[PDB]
């Protein structure tokens, strides 16, 4: 019944957004909640954000 078939291959690049699952090797799950500016990130005396 099939005369011909066309397979298109799409390469999507998804980055990261609230709702994605993240976990360490230790059984700690998480859902990235907010994506915060570098300005508002807790920093040490040297000025390097976290």
């Amino acid at each position: 019944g099939v005369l011909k078939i066309v397979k298109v291959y799409l390469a999507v690049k998804r980055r990261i957004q609230p709702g994605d699952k993240m976990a360490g090797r230790h059984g700690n799950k998480g859902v990235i909640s907010k994506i915060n500016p570098i300005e508002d990130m807790p920093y040490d005396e040297n000025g390097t954000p976290v």
């Binding site: 005369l3 011909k4 066309v6 298109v8 799409l10």
Partner: protein, 50 residues
């Protein structure tokens, strides 16, 4: 009847058929988004009876 892969698709603009080649299949490297036409396909249905 048989369904055609032809690039002539009812009720779509030139903007719709742009990303398709003469044969009706999207070009390699063409960036696409949701709703964009990958393969033009048309199937026979006769006497619509409107």
């Amino acid at each position: 009847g048989p369904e055609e892969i032809t690039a002539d698709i009812p009720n779509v603009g030139e903007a719709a058929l742009s990303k398709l080649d003469e044969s009706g299949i999207v070009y390699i490297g063409a960036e696409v988004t949701g709703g964009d036409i990958l393969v033009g396909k048309v199937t026979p249905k006769g006497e619509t009876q409107l």
